[PDB]
Design a protein around this ligand. Structure first.
Ligand SMILES: CO[C@H]1/C=C/O[C@@]2(C)Oc3c(C)c(O)c4c(O)c(c(/C=N/N5CCN(C)CC5)c(O)c4c3C2=O)NC(=O)/C(C)=C\C=C\[C@H](C)[C@H](O)[C@@H](C)[C@@H](O)[C@@H](C)[C@H](OC(C)=O)[C@@H]1C
Ligand SMILES: [Zn+2]
Ligand SMILES: [Zn+2]
Lengths: 95, 1114, 105, 157, 105, 104, 53, 249
């Protein structure tokens, strides 16, 4: 019962560490823009259980991993320039 | 509870007094109570007589002699406790009475002179050195004599070793080189031997007579016709070569030393030096290597017949043989007394040098004694030793056995005798010859294994410091009542019989007799025999000797158990074990940790703090009981009374118990009911399961005391002051401090709470204007004083037991310069067991508590009683500590049969005997069952059936008798408390002695997030509010590298240590809830660039395409 | 040394021996099962291998089942050495390469 | 639940003319079992006025309205000439095993709280025997046991 | 340069050396612009160098530059680099973690 | 641009005097009574940097928007505190200076 | 499941085997009493017997 | 020698204890005189080599045996230095690996050959010069530093020399010190010299390996820190059609 379908994740990438580098950067952008970034939003969003129950799972890392295996996301080695990829990100409620 | 003894072989002699090595040596090096006429060499007298007829520069010409007459030890200035309280060396003034003589005669017999202060021993065996107890541990080194050995550097050759008593002469080595030359080595200088012979009148012919024969070895002694000429001219060229710079004919000056006179070379007075060389070399000898002053020439004594023997050993006579540098016939002990006297000898030889200088200076008719003597050399030399030498330990005080062990400790390392921890392997090995002298078990585990060791039980150190064992004498057939302590040397001559050997009354019982001779085991005729063993105990150390079924313990696990016992923390309800080896009475007693009556009388005053007793006449003594003191190790040793107000006394029976003592029987832990089975992975690997029922019974609970200290100094900015008016502080804070700044007796003290208040001045700038305008206007006026108090370290604390204060000038109190007043606060704790405590039994079964189970769970016997510890079986057969099993079975008998036992080592309980006891015990345990109207319930059967199918029970027999069998076998039907059912297949259950050890989870374990980083290194350490950070070692770095852990590694080297900028960016970020930093340029990079620049060396950064990039700009 | 790229692109290799010589009796024993895996498991075949009716395409990363198959093909007198890419013969200098080293992550 | 001894300021103390020492005393008091009569009751204080050369004995406690010490004998202290003893020992009602370092009873300064063994139930065993009763030869005969300190009664329990 | 809990100090040594230098440097800067006997500048220029020595590799020659009091040699600009805890060896060995703790397993 | 190769060379006395930033030709500085240094010494604030968080000595702008920092008699530049590990000094020798490493 | 001592089962052969081993040794210490074996030779067998045993 | 001493002995690559003799050339065997001094001859028509053996020598070739160059003759260890120059660097490589595993195997460990293979590769990493191209002919240089100066001074800008070299058997620790990287070479005992030598010459690092980067606290050049991966960026679908609406204005 380890990580949400972790074997299916390695398969997407050419080298182990790619999965690691992406899952990072996606959580990194996910973190900044108060989760208003999600590609899975609806009822797919990951959750917790408490003395209340069903509150959004705070861990950004978790989110990236579930977000990644819906295929929706696109990662690349060099397409899209960073200096213009930073500004355009503030489109639907930023930091 | 009643006592059942076991095994035959009765001990012809009781054990020696144990603290012998320690106590009985010093005494005879100190000759404290013997008329100063009788006092007869070695010890203080020696060192005195060694140096003393001190002639002046130009001997007997310029007047002034000065000589020793007698010495007086004083009366110690302070009480034994006074010394510990006020940090003092428990000392005595040693004055020496000396007379000075003139050329015109003076009888100036100056009324004693202070020569310095001498530390002296407790009754116990230990010393007190600036407060704090200490142990002078006894060292082993090669015994003075002549030796040989084969050349390890030169295959098929031999060196020749000459060894005098240590710090009394140098090492001399003869070694025939692969180039003809023979060469004497000495003072780490190497010269052709001939020279030294030429001085002893050896002509080039008398060499061809005494030293040709065996080979043409003299070839390299002879071709040096260069100097085989004049004795005096030899003397010079040697002097020239040895200690250079000054080459006239008064070489006789130096050469007299390593020749005649007890100046340096006194290998022996009537000791081994001769004896050894008179037995291992070529007979006939006196005192020093070569006799100098005869009638002006230097006459030979040792040098030639050595060179002879060496030569007659590279081809040589059969019977000429290499030496065993490992035999205990060449290994001596240096006792305390010997090492102290050796240091006392250094003092004098320094005072003398001083005296020699002053007689020359002053006018020869004014100078008296007292006017010549320094009194600072000896004072310092004796001081240096007891305080600073590696052979001067703290004091293993954990329990009363520990201390004892610490005294009979034998080291190989340290000063003079200098084995580095980076040497030896055969020097580690247990030598045949340790038998009876040194324990073949009970060594330390790692790194020291072999170099630190304990004294065998019955063994004892002799006049010249070889260990001797007792052996019974056998007049062919009869086994005498006469015992003989003999050398390891005087032992390789006889057919010694084991004590195992049977005897009808007082004579041998079988024709095939087991015995050792020259080591190797031999079976022998009852006539052939020459001696016997006194007891198997003889062979092992004390702690070893504390192990009930040692028989069935594998040696390796037995050492762990032999140790650990040392680690046993004294418990509140200490209790001697259900199964003993007998030895437990005496170990308590000789430790003097417990009180005992003086001369059979009657008790009179019996309360918590005192026992006083009306003796038979003898007057009246009150004995005070030390109560809740503190060990060297935080152990908390205290005495409890064990006698009734008004009763006749046992000439010396227990008056009061020690700390690990129950009724004068060594009680190092508790006995408890155990199951031997796995639980649910809860006793996985080595973990142990506890019945919380233990805690309830205040069982494994121990008292520990910590001590805290705080000083007060003056400095440029003023004095540090132990005030109670600490600034910036509530009354809540000071609630507990007396009008002084010290906590009250009996305060519950938490972490952070003020223990001792005190105020440094500190002048961190001068308060700027404007901020005084407000400081005045609003009231709160500026202050000249900082908080700097004590306060309880995070996690510590408990109840405040005692305070203590030494201020400057107090009676006998001297404390380090520029400091005045020292405060000490003692806090106490009551502990109980916990998840992560270490428990071990004497068989070497260690392990940590992993789970305290509520009584509902826990395997329980049908009658209702649950067990107390669940010990996993898988930890049994891997190690071969089978005794632990054996010990549990008897403990099952004992439990129901309600008794204690005494099964000594290699002579205790035998299976049938235990089984019989078990049979006897079961008729009771089931006697009860059936008497209270019960028997064999459906569960028990379910088991029994499948039990015979296993093959443990007899098919055909009735369920009752089936139960008996299974019981007797040490096993029994057990019930799972969790589900009313049984565990199919019976479980072995019984009583087992287990100890709670030194180490507790309480003292281990910290957590840090952020706290005081150092102003030196700039990484986390120092913990003024919380603890300090874990370290990331080189091996952890490799692992992170070996992973793909880029950042996780980088993080550990920047934002978590010295990288202030990003270190802070980290903290800020999280406070906010931002994804930590991204430390773009690591500080440690910038710091590198620069330290280099401050040395010149450009050091310049470059990007991919290769143009300077710049990493600064700040 | 770090895995720098896949396929340093070289044709060199080691032949890994499935038989051994004890240098004392001048004999030839087929070496031990563990040892052969320890030579072959997770390796990348240098040139194609054919035996016992099977054919092992070059570049096949050879599994644990594969090593077993080889051993068996070695007792059935068909193979004696096994051509395999190894760090010893890689060309990347500052590390090895994916198609060498091979597998054993 | 908590004690208080006369001229005693902590757990690690020792009273003059008392053989015992406060720890050994506390350890003994642990074993005292008190019955409550009034179910209105929650906690009270037993008073140990004890004097001189005698052997204190738990029964020596002060007699209280609705209170019954079920273990007279049971050593509390040995007192020798001079020994004065005055004590005040709390007794609360509670369930299970709640120890000093947890609850801490603040009855006044220098009181000392003591560990609590609350369960009246002492030992419990049950035997599943074979009964003879005109059905099968496969029926259980449950006989439960139970043991107390005379405060709660086997059946009551 | 940081103080310890009180009035007294804990200096950084290299300061003591960066000081012992400008000292000898100006006393040879001053000694030369007014009154130059060559015999004495054969004790002032020679003496200045042996300061710029200390500040590089103090431990050299056979007599190091010591803090007036204890015979300890005082650590130099070179001693800021060479060995145990010197900036080169440092990162490879140690550093205490800031978010950490131990305990019995 | 990024870092990809540290590279070691020798230092021009013109290189050193490029790094120099100040020049400390004024000695002894280790004051104790007040936690501040002394005049143009190895601990001076002028040549190196600000001692505390910003701060002059008599009192000036410890703020943000003005740029270009100094004072009327004792000026101390106002750009952060890590520079007290980064801003270098320099002393001018009398004449020679054999650097032992290269000599021996 | 548990380890009681009876569980360290001794084979009924330990006796036979050790009486046997014992005698082939008696006949060895008496084969060197004749000119049959050298010390080195006889020891090399005593060692070996025990080793098989 | 065996156990852990032997493992060191191999990596450190030293003349072992019991320097078992190996034939320099191939030919025939001719053992002679088992009494005074014992000697084994290797001989063909032409060459004839004489190897004098200690007597205590446990040689295992009977007379008139045929023989191969570099093949053991006396039993025990091969001096892997004598092997290199007499059978090859490749041939040496395969010996070392085979021989270390031997210890680990016989004590009981299982671990991949490819592991040991990697280290042995470094033990060979270096070469000494014969007839240089742009340096002095005594230098010890990295094998693929002098590979760009071998078949590149012949692939385009041809001329001067391809530079002639010879293989060298550096012993693991000695192959440690001789690194292109002043940074890491420093950590080691003599730090002055590295920094001396290195500064005199332009010496740039390049920060190829790991230790180096750690010393400066830079981000390790492996895993998440490997150029091959580290540059990967990640973008969303809605975010990617925020670049289709903004890159042609
Ligand atoms: C000057 O005294 C020192 C000498 C240093 O110099 C040096 C080179 O010469 C040594 C001599 C001559 C020893 O005889 C010795 C020793 O017998 C010992 C340990 C190391 N023991 N440990 C093993 C495991 N462990 C977890 C902790 C300690 C030692 O290192 C040494 C030791 C040295 O290192 N111990 C043991 O093996 C055994 C059988 C028992 C130890 C029991 C307790 C623990 C100690 O006796 C306590 C009471 C202290 O006495 C020591 C701490 C001394 O420290 C001081 C100043 O009090 C220390 C001996
Ligand atoms: Zn490759
Ligand atoms: Zn200013």
């Amino acid at each position: 019962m380890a990580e949400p379908g972790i074997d299916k994740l390695f398969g997407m990438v050419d080298s182990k560490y790619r999965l690691t580098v992406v899952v990072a950067k996606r959580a990194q952008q996910l973190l900044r823009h108060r989760f208003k970034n999600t590609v899975l939003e609806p009822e797919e969003r990951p959750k917790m259980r408490t003395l209340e129950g069903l509150y959004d799972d705070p861990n950004a890392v978790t989110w990236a991993m579930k977000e990644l295996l819906t295929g929706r996301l696109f990662f690349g080695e060099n397409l899209v320039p960073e200096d213009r990829l930073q500004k355009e990100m503030e489109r639907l409620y930023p930091t | 509870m009643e006592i059942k003894r076991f095994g035959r072989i009765r001990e012809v002699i009781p054990l020696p007094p144990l603290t012998e090595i320690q106590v009985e040596s010093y005494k005879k090096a100190l000759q404290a109570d013997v008329p100063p006429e009788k006092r007869e060499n070695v010890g203080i007298q020696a060192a005195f007589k060694e140096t003393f007829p001190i002639e002046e520069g130009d001997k007997g010409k310029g007047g002034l002699v000065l000589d020793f007459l007698e010495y007086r030890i004083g009366d110690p200035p302070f009480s034994q406790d006074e010394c510990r309280e006020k940090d003092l060396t428990y000392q005595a003034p040693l004055y020496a009475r000396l007379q000075l003589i003139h050329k015109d005669t003076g009888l100036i017999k100056e009324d004693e002179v202070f020569l310095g202060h001498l530390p002296l021993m407790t009754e116990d065996g230990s010393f007190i050195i600036n407060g704090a107890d200490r142990v002078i541990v006894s060292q082993i080194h090669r015994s003075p004599g002549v030796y040989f050995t084969p050349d390890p550097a030169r295959p098929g050759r031999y060196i020749a070793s000459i060894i005098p008593l240590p710090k009394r002469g140098p090492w001399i080595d003869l070694e025939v080189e692969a180039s003809g030359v023979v060469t004497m080595k000495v003072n780490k200088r190497k010269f052709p031997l001939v020279l030294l012979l030429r001085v002893l009148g050896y002509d080039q012919e008398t060499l061809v007579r005494e030293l040709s024969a065996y080979g043409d070895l003299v070839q390299g002694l002879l071709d040096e016709a260069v100097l085989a000429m004049r004795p005096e001219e030899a003397m010079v060229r040697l002097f020239t070569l040895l200690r250079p710079g000054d080459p006239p004919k008064k070489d006789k000056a130096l050469a007299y030393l390593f020749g005649l006179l007890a100046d340096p070379k006194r290998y022996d007075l009537g000791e081994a030096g001769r004896y050894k060389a008179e037995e291992k070399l070529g007979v006939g000898l006196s005192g020093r290597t070569l006799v100098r002053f005869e009638d002006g020439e230097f006459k030979d004594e040792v040098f030639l017949p050595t060179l002879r023997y060496l030569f007659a050993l590279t081809a040589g006579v059969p019977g000429h043989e290499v030496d065993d540098i490992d035999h205990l016939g060449n290994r001596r002990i240096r006792t305390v007394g010997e090492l102290m006297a050796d240091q006392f000898r250094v003092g004098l030889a320094r005072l003398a040098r001083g005296v020699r200088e002053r007689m020359v200076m002053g006018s020869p008719d004014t100078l008296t004694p007292a006017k010549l003597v320094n009194s600072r050399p000896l004072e310092a030399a004796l001081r240096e030793f007891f305080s600073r030498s590696q052979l001067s330990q703290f004091k293993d005080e954990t329990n009363p056995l520990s201390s004892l062990r610490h005294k009979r400790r034998i080291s190989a390392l340290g000063p003079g005798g200098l084995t580095r921890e980076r040497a030896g392997f055969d020097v580690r090995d247990v030598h045949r010859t340790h038998y009876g002298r040194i324990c073949p078990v009970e060594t330390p585990e790692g790194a020291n294994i072999g170099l630190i060791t304990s004294l065998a039980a019955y063994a004892r150190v002799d006049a010249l410091g070889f260990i001797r064992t007792p052996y019974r004498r056998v007049k062919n057939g009869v086994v005498t009542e006469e015992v003989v302590y003999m050398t390891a040397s005087e032992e390789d001559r006889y057919t010694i019989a084991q004590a195992n050997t049977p005897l009808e009354g007082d004579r041998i019982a079988t024709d095939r007799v087991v015995a050792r001779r020259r080591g190797e085991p031999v079976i022998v005729a009852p006539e052939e025999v020459e001696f016997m063993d006194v007891s198997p105990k003889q062979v092992f150390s004390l702690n070893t000797n504390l192990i009930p079924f040692l028989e069935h313990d594998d040696a390796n696990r037995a050492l762990m158990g032999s140790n650990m016992q040392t680690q046993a923390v004294p418990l509140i309800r200490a209790q001697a074990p259900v199964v003993m080896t007998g030895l437990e009475e005496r170990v308590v007693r000789d430790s003097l940790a417990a009180l005992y009556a003086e001369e059979d009388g009657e008790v009179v005053k019996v309360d918590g703090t005192r026992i006083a007793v009306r003796y038979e006449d003898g007057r009246l003594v009150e004995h005070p009981l030390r109560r809740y003191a503190r060990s060297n190790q935080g152990t908390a040793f205290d005495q409890r009374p064990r006698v009734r107000v008004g009763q006749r006394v046992k000439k010396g029976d227990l008056l009061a118990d020690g700390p690990a003592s129950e009724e004068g029987f060594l009680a190092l832990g508790q006995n408890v009911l155990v199951a031997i089975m796995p639980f649910d992975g809860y006793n996985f690997e080595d973990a142990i399961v506890i019945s919380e029922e233990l805690l309830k019974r205040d069982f494994y609970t121990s008292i520990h005391i910590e001590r805290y200290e705080i000083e007060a100094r003056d400095t440029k900015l003023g004095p540090e002051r132990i005030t109670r008016d600490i600034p910036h502080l509530s009354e809540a804070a000071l609630r507990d401090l007396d009008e002084e700044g010290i906590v009250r007796i009996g305060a519950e003290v938490k972490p952070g709470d003020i223990l001792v208040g005190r105020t440094s001045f500190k002048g961190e700038q001068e308060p700027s204007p404007e901020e005084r305008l407000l400081r005045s206007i609003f009231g709160e006026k500026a202050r000249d004083v900082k908080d700097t108090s004590l306060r309880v370290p995070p996690g510590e604390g408990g109840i405040v037991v005692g305070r203590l204060r030494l201020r400057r000038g107090d009676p006998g109190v001297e404390l380090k310069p520029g400091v005045r007043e020292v405060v000490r606060v003692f806090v106490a704790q009551k502990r109980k067991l916990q998840v992560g405590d270490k428990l071990a039994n004497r068989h070497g079964n260690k392990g940590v508590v992993a789970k305290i189970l509520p009584v509902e769970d826990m395997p329980h016997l049908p009658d209702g009683t649950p067990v107390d510890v669940i010990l996993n079986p898988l930890g049994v057969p891997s190690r071969m500590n089978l005794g632990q099993i054996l010990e549990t079975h008897l403990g099952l008998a004992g439990y129901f049969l309600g008794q204690r036992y005494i099964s000594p080592v290699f002579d205790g309980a035998t299976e049938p005997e235990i089984k019989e006891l078990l049979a006897e015990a079961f008729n009771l345990y089931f006697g009860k069952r059936q008497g209270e109207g019960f028997g064999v319930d459906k569960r028990e059967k379910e088991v029994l059936a499948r039990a015979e199918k296993l093959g443990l029970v007899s098919p055909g027999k009735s369920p009752e008798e089936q139960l008996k069998e299974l019981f007797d076998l040490g096993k029994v039907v057990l019930y799972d408390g969790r589900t009313g059912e049984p565990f199919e297949g019976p479980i072995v259950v019984g009583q087992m002695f287990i100890m709670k050890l030194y180490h507790m989870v309480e003292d281990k374990m910290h957590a840090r997030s952020t706290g005081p980083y150092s102003l030196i290194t700039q990484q986390p350490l120092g913990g003024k509010a919380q603890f300090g950070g874990q370290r990331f070692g080189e091996m952890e770095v490799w692992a992170l590298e070996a992973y793909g852990a880029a950042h996780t590694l980088q993080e550990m080297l920047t934002i978590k240590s010295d990288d202030i900028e990003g270190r802070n960016a980290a903290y800020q970020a999280i406070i906010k809830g931002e994804d930590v930093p991204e430390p773009s340029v690591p500080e440690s990079f910038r710091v590198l660039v620069k330290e280099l620049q401050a040395l010149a060396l450009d050091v310049q950064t470059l990007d991919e395409k290769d143009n300077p990039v710049d990493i600064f700009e700040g | 040394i770090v895995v720098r790229e896949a396929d340093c692109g070289t044709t060199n290799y080691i032949s890994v021996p499935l038989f051994q010589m004890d240098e004392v009796t001048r004999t030839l024993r087929l070496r031990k099962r563990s040892d052969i895996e320890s030579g072959l498991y997770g390796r990348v075949l240098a040139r194609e291998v054919e035996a016992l009716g099977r054919r092992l395409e070059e570049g096949r990363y050879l599994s644990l089942e594969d090593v077993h198959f080889l051993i068996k093909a070695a007792e059935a007198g068909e193979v004696r050495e096994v051509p395999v890419r190894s760090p010893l013969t890689c060309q990347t200098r500052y590390g090895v390469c994916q198609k060498c080293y091979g597998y054993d992550l | 639940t908590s004690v208080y001894i006369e001229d005693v300021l902590h757990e690690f103390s020792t009273i003059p003319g008392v053989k015992e020492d406060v720890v050994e005393i506390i350890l003994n008091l642990k074993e005292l079992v008190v019955r409550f009569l009034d179910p209105k009751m929650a906690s009270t204080t037993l008073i140990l006025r004890a004097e001189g050369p005698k052997e204190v004995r738990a029964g020596d406690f002060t007699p209280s309205a609705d209170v019954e010490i079920m273990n007279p004998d049971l050593h509390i202290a040995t007192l020798e000439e001079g020994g004065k003893l005055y004590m005040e020992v709390r007794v609360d009602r509670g369930v299970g095993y709640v120890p000093a370092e947890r609850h801490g009873i603040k009855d006044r300064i220098n009181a000392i709280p003591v560990d609590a063994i609350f369960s009246p139930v002492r030992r419990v065993a049950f035997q599943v025997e074979d009964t003879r009763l005109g059905q099968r030869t496969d029926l259980d005969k449950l006989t439960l046991r139970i043991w107390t300190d005379g405060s709660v009664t086997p059946l009551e329990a | 340069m940081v103080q310890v809990d009180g009035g007294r100090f804990a200096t950084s040594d290299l300061n003591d050396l960066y000081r012992r230098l400008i000292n000898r440097n100006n006393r040879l800067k001053k000694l030369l612009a007014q009154g130059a006997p060559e015999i004495i500048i054969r004790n002032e220029k020679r003496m200045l160098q042996e300061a710029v020595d200390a500040v590089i590799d103090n431990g050299r020659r056979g007599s190091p530059v010591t803090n007036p009091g204890s015979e300890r040699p005082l650590r130099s600009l070179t001693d800021i680099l060479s060995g145990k805890q010197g900036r080169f060896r440092q990162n490879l060995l140690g550093k205490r973690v800031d978010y950490s703790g131990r305990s019995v397993i | 641009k990024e870092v990809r190769k540290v590279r070691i060379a020798l230092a021009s006395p013109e290189k050193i005097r490029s790094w120099s930033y100040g020049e400390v030709e004024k000695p002894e500085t280790i004051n104790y009574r007040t936690l501040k240094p002394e005049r143009d010494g190895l601990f001076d604030e002028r040549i190196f940097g600000p001692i505390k968080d910003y701060e002059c000595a008599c009192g000036k702008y410890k703020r943000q928007r003005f740029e270009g920092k100094v004072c009327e008699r004792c000026g101390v530049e106002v750009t952060r505190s890590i520079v007290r590990r980064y801003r270098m000094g320099h002393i001018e020798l009398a004449t020679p200076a054999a650097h032992i490493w290269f000599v021996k | 499941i548990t380890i009681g001592i009876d569980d360290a089962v001794i084979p009924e052969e330990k006796q036979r085997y050790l009486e046997e081993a014992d005698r082939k040794l008696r006949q060895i210490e008496q084969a060197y009493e004749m000119g049959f074996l050298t010390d080195r030779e006889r020891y090399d067998q005593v060692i070996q017997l025990w080793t098989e045993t | 020698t065996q156990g852990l001493p032997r493992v060191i002995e191999l990596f450190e690559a030293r003349r072992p204890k019991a320097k078992a003799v190996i034939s320099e050339i191939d030919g025939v065997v001719r053992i002679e005189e088992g009494e005074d001094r014992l000697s084994v001859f290797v001989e063909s028509e032409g060459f004839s080599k004489e190897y004098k053996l200690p007597k205590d020598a446990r040689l295992l070739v009977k007379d008139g045996d045929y023989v191969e160059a570099g093949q053991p003759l006396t039993r025990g260890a091969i001096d892997p230095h004598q092997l290199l120059e007499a059978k090859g660097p490749e041939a040496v490589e395969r010996y070392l690996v085979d021989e270390i595993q031997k210890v680990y195997r016989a004590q009981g460990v299982k671990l991949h050959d490819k592991h040991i293979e990697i280290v042995v590769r470094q033990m060979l990493k270096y070469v000494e010069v014969t007839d240089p191209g742009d340096s002095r002919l005594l230098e010890g240089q990295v094998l693929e530093k002098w590979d760009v100066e071998a078949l590149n001074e012949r692939l385009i800008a041809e001329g001067k020399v391809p530079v002639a070299w010879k293989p060298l058997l550096m012993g693991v620790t000695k192959s440690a010190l001789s690194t292109k990287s002043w940074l890491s070479a420093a950590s080691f005992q003599n730090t002055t010299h590295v920094l001396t030598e290195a500064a005199i010459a332009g010496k740039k690092d390049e920060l190829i390996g790991l230790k180096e980067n750690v010393i400066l606290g830079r981000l390790i050049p492996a895993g998440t820190g490997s150029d091959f991966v580290r540059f990967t960026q990640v973008v969303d679908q809605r975010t990617l059609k925020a670049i289709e609406e903004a890159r042609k204005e």
